[PDB]
Amino acid sequence: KTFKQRRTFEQRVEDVRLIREQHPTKIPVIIERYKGEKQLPVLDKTKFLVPDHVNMSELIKIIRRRLQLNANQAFFLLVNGHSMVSVSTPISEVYESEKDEDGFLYMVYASQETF
Ligand SMILES: Clc1cccc2[nH]cnc12
Ligand SMILES: [Cl-]
Protein backbone atom coordinates (compact mmCIF):
# COMPACT_ATOMS: atom_id res chain seq x y z
CA LYS A 1 0.00 0.00 0.00
CA THR A 2 2.53 2.73 1.20
CA PHE A 3 5.46 3.84 -1.05
CA LYS A 4 8.23 2.30 1.14
CA GLN A 5 6.21 -1.00 0.96
CA ARG A 6 5.85 -0.91 -2.91
CA ARG A 7 9.57 -0.24 -3.73
CA THR A 8 12.85 -1.84 -2.41
CA PHE A 9 15.36 0.55 -0.70
CA GLU A 10 17.52 -0.24 -3.82
CA GLN A 11 14.72 1.03 -6.15
CA ARG A 12 13.89 4.24 -4.13
CA VAL A 13 17.63 5.19 -4.08
CA GLU A 14 18.10 4.64 -7.89
CA ASP A 15 14.97 6.78 -8.59
CA VAL A 16 16.28 9.71 -6.43
CA ARG A 17 19.59 9.45 -8.40
CA LEU A 18 17.70 9.64 -11.81
CA ILE A 19 15.67 12.71 -10.53
CA ARG A 20 19.05 14.35 -9.60
CA GLU A 21 20.22 13.63 -13.21
CA GLN A 22 16.99 14.68 -15.04
CA HIS A 23 15.44 17.33 -12.65
CA PRO A 24 18.58 18.51 -10.85
CA THR A 25 16.76 21.68 -9.50
CA LYS A 26 13.79 19.65 -8.06
CA ILE A 27 13.32 18.19 -4.52
CA PRO A 28 11.94 14.59 -4.67
CA VAL A 29 8.89 14.51 -2.33
CA ILE A 30 6.66 11.57 -1.30
CA ILE A 31 3.24 12.94 -0.18
CA GLU A 32 0.78 10.40 1.35
CA ARG A 33 -2.62 10.58 3.06
CA TYR A 34 -2.63 9.61 6.80
CA LYS A 35 -3.87 5.96 6.80
CA GLY A 36 -6.55 7.04 9.43
CA GLU A 37 -7.82 10.03 7.29
CA LYS A 38 -11.68 10.16 6.94
CA GLN A 39 -12.32 13.69 5.49
CA LEU A 40 -9.59 14.65 2.88
CA PRO A 41 -9.32 12.80 -0.48
CA VAL A 42 -6.28 10.80 -1.79
CA LEU A 43 -3.91 12.56 -4.27
CA ASP A 44 -3.70 11.34 -7.92
CA LYS A 45 0.03 10.47 -7.46
CA THR A 46 2.62 9.82 -4.67
CA LYS A 47 5.92 11.29 -6.04
CA PHE A 48 6.29 15.09 -6.66
CA LEU A 49 9.21 17.17 -8.04
CA VAL A 50 9.06 20.49 -5.95
CA PRO A 51 11.07 23.59 -7.12
CA ASP A 52 13.83 23.93 -4.45
CA HIS A 53 13.19 27.74 -3.83
CA VAL A 54 9.53 27.31 -2.67
CA ASN A 55 9.05 27.58 1.15
CA MET A 56 6.81 25.08 3.12
CA SER A 57 3.99 27.73 3.31
CA GLU A 58 3.84 27.67 -0.56
CA LEU A 59 4.07 23.79 -0.67
CA ILE A 60 0.94 23.58 1.59
CA LYS A 61 -0.93 25.97 -0.84
CA ILE A 62 0.17 23.83 -3.80
CA ILE A 63 -1.20 20.60 -2.17
CA ARG A 64 -4.44 22.38 -1.01
CA ARG A 65 -4.88 23.38 -4.74
CA ARG A 66 -4.07 19.82 -5.91
CA LEU A 67 -6.71 18.41 -3.46
CA GLN A 68 -9.04 21.31 -4.64
CA LEU A 69 -9.86 22.07 -0.90
CA ASN A 70 -11.99 25.10 0.15
CA ALA A 71 -11.08 27.81 2.70
CA ASN A 72 -12.53 26.17 5.91
CA GLN A 73 -11.32 22.54 5.32
CA ALA A 74 -8.33 21.84 7.69
CA PHE A 75 -5.01 20.40 6.35
CA PHE A 76 -1.94 19.37 8.42
CA LEU A 77 1.35 18.23 6.83
CA LEU A 78 3.96 16.15 8.69
CA VAL A 79 7.55 16.11 7.34
CA ASN A 80 9.82 13.11 8.18
CA GLY A 81 7.18 11.95 10.76
CA HIS A 82 6.94 15.22 12.80
CA SER A 83 5.31 18.72 12.75
CA MET A 84 6.98 21.53 10.75
CA VAL A 85 8.84 23.94 13.12
CA SER A 86 8.23 26.75 10.49
CA VAL A 87 6.47 27.22 7.08
CA SER A 88 8.99 30.01 6.15
CA THR A 89 11.91 27.58 5.59
CA PRO A 90 12.91 27.00 1.91
CA ILE A 91 12.36 23.35 0.79
CA SER A 92 16.10 23.03 -0.26
CA GLU A 93 17.04 23.59 3.48
CA VAL A 94 14.19 21.38 4.84
CA TYR A 95 15.41 18.65 2.46
CA GLU A 96 19.01 18.68 3.77
CA SER A 97 17.92 18.25 7.45
CA GLU A 98 14.73 16.03 6.99
CA LYS A 99 15.49 13.83 3.94
CA ASP A 100 15.30 9.99 4.40
CA GLU A 101 18.39 7.73 3.87
CA ASP A 102 16.85 6.61 0.44
CA GLY A 103 16.98 10.34 -0.59
CA PHE A 104 13.22 11.15 -0.75
CA LEU A 105 11.55 13.72 1.52
CA TYR A 106 8.47 11.97 3.16
CA MET A 107 5.27 13.91 3.98
CA VAL A 108 1.83 12.85 5.35
CA TYR A 109 -1.39 14.99 5.50
CA ALA A 110 -4.53 14.83 7.69
CA SER A 111 -7.59 17.02 8.59
CA GLN A 112 -6.70 16.60 12.34
CA GLU A 113 -3.47 17.80 14.12
CA THR A 114 -3.66 14.22 15.68
CA PHE A 115 -2.17 11.65 13.17
CL1 LIG B 1 0.74 18.93 -4.57
C2 LIG B 1 2.19 19.54 -5.26
C3 LIG B 1 3.28 19.80 -4.46
C4 LIG B 1 4.44 20.30 -5.00
C5 LIG B 1 4.57 20.55 -6.35
C6 LIG B 1 3.49 20.27 -7.17
N7 LIG B 1 3.34 20.42 -8.55
C8 LIG B 1 2.10 20.02 -8.78
N9 LIG B 1 1.44 19.63 -7.68
C10 LIG B 1 2.30 19.77 -6.63
CL1 LIG C 1 15.53 20.83 -13.19
Domain boundaries, the chain: 1-115
Radius of gyration of the chain (CA): 14
Please tell me the distance from the alpha carbon of residue 31 to that of residue 72, in angstroms, as a whole number.
Answer: 21
Does residue 109's CB lie within 6 angstroms of at least one atom of ligand 1?
no
Q: What is the DSSP letter of 55?
A: B
Resolution to 1 decimal, in Å? 1.9
CB–CB of 82/88 below 8 Å? no
Please tell me the distance from the alpha carbon of residue 28 to that of residue 20, in angstroms, as a whole number.
Answer: 9
Query: What is the chain's length?
Result: 115
CA max distance for the chain: 41
CB–CB of 55/94 below 8 Å? no
Does residue 62's CB lie within 6 angstroms of at least one atom of ligand 1?
yes
From the CA of 65, which ligand is nearest?
1
From 25, 50, 87, 105, mutation site for ligand 1 pocket: most ligand atoms within 8 A of C-beta: 50
Q: Is 109 in a helix, a strand, or coil?
A: strand
